[PDB]
Short mmCIF file of C-alpha atoms in Angstrom, two decimals:
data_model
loop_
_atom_site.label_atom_id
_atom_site.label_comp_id
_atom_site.label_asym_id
_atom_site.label_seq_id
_atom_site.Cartn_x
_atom_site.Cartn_y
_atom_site.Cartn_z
CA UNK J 1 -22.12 11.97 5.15
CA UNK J 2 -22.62 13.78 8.45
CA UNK J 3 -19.27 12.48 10.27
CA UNK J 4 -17.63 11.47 6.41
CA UNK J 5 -15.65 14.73 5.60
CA UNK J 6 -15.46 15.38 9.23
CA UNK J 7 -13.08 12.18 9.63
CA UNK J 8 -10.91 13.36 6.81
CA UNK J 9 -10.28 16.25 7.85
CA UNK J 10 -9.77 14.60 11.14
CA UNK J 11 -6.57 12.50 8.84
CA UNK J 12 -5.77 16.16 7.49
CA UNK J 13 -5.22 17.15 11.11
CA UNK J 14 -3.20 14.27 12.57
CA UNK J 15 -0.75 14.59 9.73
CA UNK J 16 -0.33 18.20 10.09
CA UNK J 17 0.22 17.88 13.99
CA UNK J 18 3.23 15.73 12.82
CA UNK J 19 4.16 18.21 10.69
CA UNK J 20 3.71 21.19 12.98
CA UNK J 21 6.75 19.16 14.92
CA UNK J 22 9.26 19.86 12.06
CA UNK J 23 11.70 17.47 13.12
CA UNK J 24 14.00 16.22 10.95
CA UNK J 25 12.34 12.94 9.33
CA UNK J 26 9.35 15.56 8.42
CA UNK J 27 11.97 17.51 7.36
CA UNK J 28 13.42 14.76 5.09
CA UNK J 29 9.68 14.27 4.07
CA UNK J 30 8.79 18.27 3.52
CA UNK J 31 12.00 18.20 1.01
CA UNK J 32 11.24 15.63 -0.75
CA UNK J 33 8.03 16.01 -1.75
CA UNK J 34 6.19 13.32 0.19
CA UNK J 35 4.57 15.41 3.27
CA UNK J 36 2.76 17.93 0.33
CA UNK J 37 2.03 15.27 -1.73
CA UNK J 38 0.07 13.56 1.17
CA UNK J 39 -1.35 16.62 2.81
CA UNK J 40 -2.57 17.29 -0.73
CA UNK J 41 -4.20 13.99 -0.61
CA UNK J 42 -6.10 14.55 2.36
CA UNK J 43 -6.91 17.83 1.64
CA UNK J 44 -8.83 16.68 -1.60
CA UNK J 45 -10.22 13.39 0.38
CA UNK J 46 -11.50 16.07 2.76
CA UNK J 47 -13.17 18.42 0.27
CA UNK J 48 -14.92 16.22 -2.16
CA UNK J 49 -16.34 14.19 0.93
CA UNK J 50 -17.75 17.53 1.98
CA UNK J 51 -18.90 18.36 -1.84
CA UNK J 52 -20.48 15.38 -1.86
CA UNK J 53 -22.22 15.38 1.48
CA UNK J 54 -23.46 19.20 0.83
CA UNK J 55 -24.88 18.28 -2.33
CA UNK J 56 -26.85 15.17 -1.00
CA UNK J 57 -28.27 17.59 1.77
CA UNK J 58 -29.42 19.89 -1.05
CA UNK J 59 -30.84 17.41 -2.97
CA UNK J 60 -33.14 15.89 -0.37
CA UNK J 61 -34.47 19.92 1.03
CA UNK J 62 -37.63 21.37 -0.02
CA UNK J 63 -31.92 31.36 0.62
CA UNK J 64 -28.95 32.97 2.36
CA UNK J 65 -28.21 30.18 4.59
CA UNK J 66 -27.03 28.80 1.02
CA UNK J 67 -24.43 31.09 0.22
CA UNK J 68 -22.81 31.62 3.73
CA UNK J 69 -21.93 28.18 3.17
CA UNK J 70 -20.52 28.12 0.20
CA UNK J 71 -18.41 30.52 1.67
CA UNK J 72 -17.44 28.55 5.35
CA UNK J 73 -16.83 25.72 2.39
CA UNK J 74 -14.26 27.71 0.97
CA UNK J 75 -12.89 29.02 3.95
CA UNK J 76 -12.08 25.49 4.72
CA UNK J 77 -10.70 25.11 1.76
CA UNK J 78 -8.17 27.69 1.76
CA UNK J 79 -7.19 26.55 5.15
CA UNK J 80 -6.13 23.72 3.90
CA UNK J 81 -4.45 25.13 0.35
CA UNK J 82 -2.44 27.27 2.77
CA UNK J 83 -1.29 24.98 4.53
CA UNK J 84 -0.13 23.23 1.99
CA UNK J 85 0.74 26.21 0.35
CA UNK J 86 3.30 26.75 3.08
CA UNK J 87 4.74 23.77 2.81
CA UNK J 88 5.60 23.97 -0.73
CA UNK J 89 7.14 26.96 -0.26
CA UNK J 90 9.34 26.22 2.91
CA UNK J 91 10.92 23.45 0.20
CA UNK J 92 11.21 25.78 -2.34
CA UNK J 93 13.24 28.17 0.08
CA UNK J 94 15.41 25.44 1.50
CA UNK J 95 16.42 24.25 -1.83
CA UNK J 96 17.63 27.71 -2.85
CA UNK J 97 19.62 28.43 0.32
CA UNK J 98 22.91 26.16 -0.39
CA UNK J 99 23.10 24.36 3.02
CA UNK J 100 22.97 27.58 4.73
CA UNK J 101 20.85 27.57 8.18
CA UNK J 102 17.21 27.06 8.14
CA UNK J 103 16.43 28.02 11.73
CA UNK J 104 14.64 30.69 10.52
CA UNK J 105 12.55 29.35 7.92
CA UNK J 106 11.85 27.12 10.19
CA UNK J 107 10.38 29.11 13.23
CA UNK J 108 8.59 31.24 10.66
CA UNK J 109 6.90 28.52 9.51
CA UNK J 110 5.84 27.01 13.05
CA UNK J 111 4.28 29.84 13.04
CA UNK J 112 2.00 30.31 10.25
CA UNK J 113 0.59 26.55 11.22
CA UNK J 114 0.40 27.54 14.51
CA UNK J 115 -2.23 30.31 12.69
CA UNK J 116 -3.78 27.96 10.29
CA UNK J 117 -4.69 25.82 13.11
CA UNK J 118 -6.64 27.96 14.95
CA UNK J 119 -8.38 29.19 11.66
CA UNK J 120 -9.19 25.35 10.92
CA UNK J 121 -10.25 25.00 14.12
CA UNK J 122 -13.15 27.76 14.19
CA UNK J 123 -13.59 27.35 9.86
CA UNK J 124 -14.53 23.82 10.69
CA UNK J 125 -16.88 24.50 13.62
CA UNK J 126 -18.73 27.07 11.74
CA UNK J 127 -18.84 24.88 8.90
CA UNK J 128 -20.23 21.63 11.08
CA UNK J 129 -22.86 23.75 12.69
CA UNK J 130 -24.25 25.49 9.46
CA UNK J 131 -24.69 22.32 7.76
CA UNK J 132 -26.72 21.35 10.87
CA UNK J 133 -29.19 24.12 10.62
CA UNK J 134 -29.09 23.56 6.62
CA UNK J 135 -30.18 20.32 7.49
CA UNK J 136 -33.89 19.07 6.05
#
C-alpha cells in the first residue's frame, strides 16, 4: 500500500549503500554469491509490493496516465535489474582474472552505482507522484 513498496525499496537502498562501499567483506559477499542473491530479494520484495499496490488502486477507480506508469514501473524495475545486473557481472569478471588486480573493476563499478543511484532516485519520485495523481 501507499508507503508498502516504498519501504522496500527503502531495504533495496540501504543494502546497496553498503554495497556502493565495496570494501572487502562486500567483496567477500559480491563473490560469493550472497550480496546478488539478497539484492535480488529485495528487488522482487520491492516490485511485487508495487504490483500489488498498483493493481488495488486500479481496482477501486472508476487513459494515458495508465500507460506512463506502466512505464515509470518498469523504469524502476530496470534500475534495480541493473544493479544487480552489475553485480553479477563484477563476480563473473573477478573470477576470470586469476588473482590479478581488481582496482579497476572496481572503480568502474563505483561508478555505474554511483549512476544507478541517481536514476533510482528520480525513477522513484516520478513513480511516487504518478501513483498520487492516479489515485481515486
Amino acid at each position: 500500500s501507499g508507503q508498502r513498496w516504498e519501504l522496500a525499496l527503502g531495504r533495496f537502498w540501504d543494502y546497496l549503500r553498503w554495497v556502493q562501499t565495496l570494501s572487502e567483506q562486500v567483496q567477500e559477499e559480491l563473490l560469493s554469491s550472497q550480496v546478488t542473491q539478497e539484492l535480488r530479494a529485495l528487488m522482487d520484495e520491492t516490485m511485487k509490493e508495487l504490483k500489488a499496490y498498483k493493481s488495488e488502486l486500479e481496482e477501486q477507480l472508476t487513459a494515458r496516465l495508465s500507460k506512463e506508469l506502466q512505464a515509470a514501473q518498469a523504469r524502476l524495475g530496470a534500475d534495480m535489474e541493473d544493479v544487480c545486473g552489475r553485480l553479477v557481472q563484477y563476480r563473473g569478471e573477478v573470477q576470470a582474472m586469476l588473482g590479478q588486480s581488481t582496482e579497476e573493476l572496481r572503480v568502474r563499478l563505483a561508478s555505474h552505482l554511483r549512476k544507478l543511484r541517481k536514476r533510482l532516485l528520480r525513477d522513484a519520485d516520478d513513480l511516487q507522484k504518478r501513483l498520487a495523481v492516479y489515485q481515486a
